[PDB]
Structure formats: structure tokens, C-alpha cells
Amino acid sequence: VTLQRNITLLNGVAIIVGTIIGSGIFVTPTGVLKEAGSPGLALVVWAACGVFSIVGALCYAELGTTISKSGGDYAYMLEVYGSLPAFLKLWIELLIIRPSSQYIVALVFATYLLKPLFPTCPVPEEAAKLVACLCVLLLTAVNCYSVKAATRVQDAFAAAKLLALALIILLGFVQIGKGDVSNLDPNFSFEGTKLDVGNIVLALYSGLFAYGGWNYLNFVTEEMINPYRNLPLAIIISLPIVTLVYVLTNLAYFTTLSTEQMLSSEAVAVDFGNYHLGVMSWIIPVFVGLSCFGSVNGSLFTSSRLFFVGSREGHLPSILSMIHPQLLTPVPSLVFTCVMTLLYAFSKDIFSVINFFSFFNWLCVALAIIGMIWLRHRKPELERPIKVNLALPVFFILACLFLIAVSFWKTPVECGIGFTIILSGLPVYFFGVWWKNKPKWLLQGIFSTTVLCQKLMQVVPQET
């Protein structure tokens, strides 16, 4: 009774495309304009974040072919640095990182779905919260039913994302096709290029939100068919597509609108559709709403498989990683990753949890690649189907150190608050994993609630 591999090459391309292309190409093409000023340097920022994500994805592709276990960026830290750093990453990825991301994308789905009922006004907050909590509860029940249904949802909505962005691109091409230039001039595109770079870094920090999720196929290996071919082939097909679509979307945003109406807009795609369609412009909010529907599916699919593997190493309770037989789906882990996401519907302002843990989110990717280089000069004989040309990891390590160095010298305010979360996660580690010689007051109670949930969900343990 195992997890019964189903993921093809095209399903992986769908997972990466559908998880990456979510809200950030619709709710962010401004922040880079308000901290970059000129429309040329914003395109420079988007292209730079694209190259950064591509080189990091190639390093993770050769990592995932080297080690080849699920729970990527966690299994690698487990094979390199031991038990305690792997638990600390797993702990704050179970507490904060995944249930905030899924809730934020579900909320953006609900807001841009209810936008055509409230055209120039605000959507009521307990009506959008209660639809965000329906999206997660429906996708966690679709994922608990079958795996191939959950992969059919993902590539249907990945096709919908591309057909919704291609319409915006071809609407921009016929706007440049009628010979008028509000922006994108040859010599008039750099007026207000904010220099100093001091304000720029903040920018590079804003354009990387739309590229996040490129390392999510590494969580769901051991479920691909022929992974040594189909993991890097699904990465290098998916990710250069995104960095091209992300610049052909922003420059088409720049042909129609000007810099004074973009900076005075809270929904750039809605203001694009209002000018280029008029009536029958309601399809743009519902198509940027369905864009955020396929990004919660692809991130609930991998978050369950992360806590699956976190329990096989003894870092979690063993009720997780118990497969339901004849459905062959991790039900008690999907219930957990749904309940943790629905717990963030009590937060009023959780958009500022991004600055709290942006330093550790890149410190893990730095630490994984330092250990990747360290493993090559320590165990220099494994089956390596794809080896990377070096000094791209050397570039990426110091680039992630440059991205973490602006968290301590520019805005060091909340990083000390964020560090206390990890050091409060440490005694949880000691109590849960390290404290053996356990008394029978607690161990039999643990066995009793585990067999209770086991009889309730009808799940059996794994077994090669």
C-alpha cells in the first residue's frame, strides 16, 4: 500500500505553471512601478527576477535528480544538516508559510470573483472571507477523493490561465497596432528612473512574489513517472515560459495605460478590461479569479505530501502518512493542511507576514545549495543524471545572501520577532522527538487517539 505514482510530464508542467501564475501578475504590476518609477527599469526588474528564478530552478532540478525523495528543500536539509534544522524548517513551514500563502491566494480569488457585483467600490469582507473558506474546503475534498481528479483540475485551470493572459497580450498588440504611444517610447521610457539602488532592492523584493512556487515539483517527486527524465524536463519547459509571459503582459499593460492612471489603480487588469472592452469586460475579473483557483489546488497538493514525508522521518505524529486503502490518498494530512489554512481566516492584516519570514524563505534555499555543493565534494559518486555547470550555484548562494542582507541592514525591525518563532519551535522538537523514555501516562493516550482517528478515517499505514 503505497502512493501509486500518477504524475506525467505535462502534469508537472501544469503544476508549476498553475502554482506560479496566480495573483502576482494581477495585483503587483504597480509596486515595481511605484518603487522603480520608470517603465524601463520595471521591465528590467521582471527580467532579473526571471533569470534568478530560472537559475535557482536548474539547481533544484539537479538536486531533485540527485537525492530523489519527496519533501524537497526539506529532505535535502535532512540528508545534509541532520535532524534539528530539518525540523525547524518543517515546523515553521507547517505553522506559517503554507497556510498563509494558500489563504491569501484564496482571498484574492474570492475578491476578484465578487468584483463584477461591486464595480467601483469595495467588496464586503465577510462575504469574501466566507468564499475563500469555501474554495479551500472544496479543493481539499476533491483532493481527498482521487489524485487524477486533482491533476485534471490543475491542467484545466492552467489552460484557463494561459487563455486569459494571451487575450491580454493580443489586446495589447492591437493597441500598438493602431499607432499611438502612451508609453514604451524609444527615448522616452526612462524619465523617473529611480536610481540610488537603495530604493530598488525593495523593488527586486516586490517582483519576486509573482515568481514564487518554482520549487514545488520537488515536493511531489516519488509520484512522477520516470522522475530522472521528467523532473528537469518539466522545469526547463515551464519556467522560461513564465518569464516571457510576465514581460509580454506588463509591456502590454504599458501600451494602454499611463503612469498616472496605473499608480492610481488598485486593479490593473480591471482598468485594462474597462478600456479595451467596455461592456463584456466582466470576463477579466472572473478570469483573474479562476487564475487564483488553480494556485490553491497546486499548493494544497504539495503541502499534503510535505507533511506526509515529515511524518515518515519521525518528525511528526504517525497518523499523518497513513494512506486510505482503495482511494490511495493521504486523507489525514489533507485534513490537516486544510484546517491550518482555514485557521488564517481570523487574521485581519496578514499581508505583512511576508516581511516577517522573507529572510528565512531564502536562507533555506541558500542552505540547500551550500549543502548541494558540500555533498558533491563529500560523496562524489552517485547516479547523477543531470549535473549542473558550476558557478551558477556560487552565483545563487551570494545572491540569496544579498537578498537576506537587506533584511538586517534596511528593515531589521520584525526579524527579531520572527526569530523567536523558530526558537519557540525548538522546545517542540525536544519534547516531540528527543524525549524518549516516555511515560505510559502519555504514550497510551497517544496510541488511543491515533487508533481513534485511524478508525474514523479508515486509513492504513504505508508499506513498500
Partner: protein, 471 residues
């Protein structure tokens, strides 16, 4: 297997009836809770009120207009033609003005009617191939150009005290000719000397709107009484009309409040034009301590504000000798006025005031940025309320957007606010505290929330407090 059963004994135990009933009941309970939450979201969405439709504004509803009377006195000697006007079109984009009322540029000799043609440009301002070049260069910066067509702008009677209707047929023939060249509106001044004025204005309005609905027609009187203004506006009502209605006071705030509220109540809350003259500066009527207080009022009242050139720097024709008051010289830099080299200071120039963050031009730029952006100042609703002896306090509020509260102290001695509101509808009532966006005098923290019961106004001070849509 690890801290639980294995497959065999689990399917042995947990396959009994009752244990199947519990999990089927829990699945049914899950789906009933989901269909309860969906209907809850539906009846929350339906019980949200509505939100209002935008009122389909024109381009002159969006910001201010800028009157340039004499073209030579705007630049200076030498480059006092239409080609030199093209170089200033980014300073006008700094002011965020939406329109430009160019002065009369046609060929007017003097009081001879037959030697006055409105279709031909006088050669001292340029030619038509410079004029459409200026028009196409101003269309790039989102600035519309309005052409003044007052015929006898060099004599004393502007409508030729001789033959009457013949000089109006050549205005009727010139509207069509200049509208195809691409101007965005027209202005006629001094129409208290025009015979059958209310009949001619309706004909010219129907000609101008019969071309496009993006076309303006401004009229100007020297009248100051309300019943003579309302007589011009009873047939045609899309007409902008600048006059000297607010010019009279220069004084206490009760009279200004009564003038604004009586005009807005008599005209039925239509789109009006707020001004202090038809061709004159603000310093012709106001002392120099009341310019910042009037600039805050003219940008926050429900209409189109119309200014002359030099009103942003406080230009004064009675501060420099040897200049006509109908056309003073624009002080761009320290070398602008050539006679008496040293009479012009540094705080009286454009570039000397573009550096000070507490200047007069720095107030104009902030207010003109706030007016053309916020929906409560674009098409909000006006409500003035009662206050202390010498105050003018009002509120703008559109639908659910960020509300605005303007408090003006026209008095000479200081006093408190005393904002006994008690009169506004529930969508715009006062909170217990509000922000501070702006003040016309230094000595206050711009951004920090005050509370609106210990509000104190020092002499000639105005405040621009702000508060959102709440209870």
C-alpha cells in the same frame, strides 16, 4: 504499524455497522455545513446595499483651468509668440491643469468692424502652422486648449458699440472654422455689453455641443448680483459662466458662506465655475494674507476652478512700478523684469518658489494634485455646517470613498472650531477624530490625527482634515 494498527486488524474492527454509519453521517454533515456556508455567503452578498454609478464626467470636470491673457507678458520680449508657448507646456503639466484659455490671437485692428477678422491670426503671435503645432504638442501632455474669441479686445467696448448683429454672425462663422482646426472650446468675455446675450449664447452653445459633447463654451460678465447671473443661465444650463460674484467680500466668512450656499441652492446644485473674476488676478481683490485661504477654498468647492497666470506664485501688479495691471509680467527667474535690476526678489519668482516646501506654489501643486485624483473632490456632495463666529466649514463625500472636511478661518483673531455638526446624513457624519492632510501655515504635524472638539484655528488658517467611510 508505528503508533497504530495495521491493515488487517483495522479492517477487522473498523468495518462493523455503526462505524460505517458514523462516517457516512460525518460525510453528510460536512456537505450540509458546506451548503449552509454557501447560502450564508449568498444572503450576505444580497444584503449588501448597492453602490452608486459614476456620473459620466467631462474633461473640464477633472481639474482646473488656466487663463493666459497676454501672450507677450507670459514669456517676455522676443519670444512672445505661439512658438515660445510650446516650451512652457511642462510647467503647466507641473500644475496639473486640464485646460488652457489662450487669449484673443485674431486680427483686430481697432474699433473698425470691417478690419476685424476672427479667422486670421495676428502676425505678432505667429501663424496657423504654429498654432496647430502648439495644439498637437499640447495634446501629448493631456492639456486641452480653449480659444478666446472676444472681437474688440484692443478697444474699450469689447463688442463694437456700432453695428450689432453683423459682428455676431462672424462669431457664428468662426466657431465652425476653429472647431475643425481642433480647439476644445471657446470663451467670450464682457457679455454685459452684448445685445441679446441670452439669445446668442444658446445658439453658440447649440453649435458647440452639436459638434461633440467634449466641447466647452465659457462666458464672462463683470456682474456681481445673483439675479442677473441667473437670468443668463435660465435658458442654457451647460454653460460655464465666470463672473465677479465672489469678488465683493474680501472679508468675513459668514458672507462667503452665504454667497456659496445661496448660489448652490439657487442654481439647483449644478456644475458651476468657481472664480473671483473673468480676467483678473487674485491679488487685485485680496490682501496677501488671504491668498492661501482662498486657494484652499477654490480647489475644494463643487465646480471647476479657474485661475489666471501668476495666481500660483501670488503675482502682484502693484508691487513693481511701470506695469499694467491688466497684464503684469510673469516672474520666471531673477532676470525677468529688466528695468530696475534688483526690485525682484527670490521668493517672488517661479524657480525661487519651486524650492521652498512651504511656499505658495508648493501649496498650489499639492491642492491641484489632490483635486484631480480623489473621487470625493471630483464629483462629491457638498454640505456646509454651522460653526463659530467667522468660520466656513464644509464636507465632501461621494459614495464610500475617503471623505474630506475643510475648515476655513477668515477672521483676524484666533478662535476654536466648535463643529456642532447635527445636520449631515448618516453616510457622512463626523468621527471623533480625523487626519490632517494639509495646512496653510507652518506649525502643525501633517499626517497625525487630531480630534475634532479641541480644534483651534489661529489667524487666517485653513485645514484639510480627512476621514474614511465608517459609523
Amino acid at each position: 504499524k508505528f503508533t497504530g494498527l495495521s491493515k488487517e486488524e483495522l479492517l477487522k474492527v473498523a468495518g462493523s455497522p455503526g462505524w460505517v454509519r458514523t462516517r457516512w453521517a460525518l460525510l453528510l454533515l460536512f456537505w450540509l455545513g458546506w451548503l449552509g456556508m454557501l447560502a450564508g455567503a449568498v444572503v450576505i452578498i444580497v444584503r449588501a446595499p448597492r453602490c452608486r454609478e459614476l456620473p459620466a464626467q467631462k474633461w473640464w470636470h477633472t481639474g482646473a483651468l488656466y487663463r493666459i491673457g497676454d501672450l507677450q507678458a507670459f514669456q517676455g520680449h522676443g519670444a512672445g509668440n505661439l512658438a515660445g508657448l510650446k516650451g512652457r507646456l511642462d510647467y503647466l503639466s507641473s500644475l496639473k491643469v486640464k485646460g488652457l484659455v489662450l487669449g484673443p490671437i485674431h486680427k483686430n485692428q481697432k474699433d473698425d468692424v470691417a478690419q476685424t477678422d476672427l479667422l486670421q491670426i495676428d502676425p505678432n503671435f505667429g501663424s496657423k502652422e504654429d498654432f496647430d503645432s502648439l495644439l498637437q504638442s499640447a495634446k501629448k501632455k493631456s492639456i486641452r486648449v480653449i480659444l478666446d474669441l472676444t472681437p474688440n479686445y484692443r478697444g474699450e467696448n469689447s463688442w463694437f458699440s456700432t453695428q450689432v448683429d453683423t459682428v455676431a454672425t462672424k462669431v457664428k462663422d468662426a466657431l465652425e472654422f476653429w472647431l475643425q482646426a481642433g480647439v476644445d472650446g471657446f470663451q467670450v468675455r464682457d457679455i454685459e455689453n452684448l445685445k441679446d446675450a441670452s439669445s446668442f449664447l444658446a445658439e453658440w452653445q447649440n453649435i458647440t455641443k452639436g459638434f461633440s459633447e467634449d466641447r466647452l463654451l465659457i462666458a464672462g460678465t463683470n456682474s456681481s448680483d445673483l439675479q442677473q447671473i441667473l437670468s443668463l443661465l435660465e435658458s442654457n444650463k451647460d454653460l460655464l459662466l465666470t463672473s465677479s460674484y465672489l469678488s465683493d467680500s474680501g472679508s468675513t466668512g459668514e458672507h462667503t458662506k452665504s454667497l456659496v450656499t445661496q448660489y448652490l441652492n439657487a442654481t439647483g446644485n449644478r456644475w458651476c465655475s468657481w472664480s473671483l473674476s473673468q480676467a483678473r488676478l487674485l491679488t487685485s481683490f485680496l490682501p496677501a494674507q488671504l491668498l492661501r485661504l482662498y486657494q484652499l477654498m477654490l480647489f475644494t468647492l463643487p465646480g471647476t476652478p479657474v485661475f489666471s497666470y501668476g495666481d500660483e506664485i501670488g503675482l502682484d501688479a502693484a508691487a513693481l512700478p511701470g506695469q499694467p495691471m491688466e497684464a503684469p509680467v510673469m516672474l520666471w527667474d531673477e532676470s525677468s523684469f529688466p528695468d530696475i535690476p534688483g526690485a525682484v526678489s527670490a521668493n517672488m519668482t517661479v524657480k525661487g518658489q519651486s524650492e521652498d516646501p512651504g511656499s505658495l506654489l508648493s501649496l498650489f501643486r499639492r491642492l491641484s494634485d489632490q483635486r484631480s485624483k480623489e473621487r470625493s473632490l471630483l464629483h462629491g456632495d457638498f454640505h456646509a455646517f454651522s460653526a463659530g463666529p467667522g468660520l466656513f466649514s464644509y464636507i465632501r463625500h461621494w459614495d464610500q470613498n475617503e471623505r474630506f472636511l475643510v475648515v476655513l478661518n477668515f477672521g483676524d483673531v484666533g478662535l476654536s472650531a466648535g463643529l456642532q455638526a447635527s445636520d449631515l446624513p448618516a453616510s457622512a457624519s463626523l468621527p471623533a477624530k480625523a487626519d490632517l492632510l494639509l495646512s496653510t501655515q507652518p506649525g502643525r504635524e501633517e499626517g497625525s490625527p487630531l480630534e475634532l472638539e479641541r480644534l483651534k484655528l489661529e489667524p487666517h488658517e485653513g485645514l484639510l482634515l480627512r476621514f474614511p467611510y465608517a459609523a
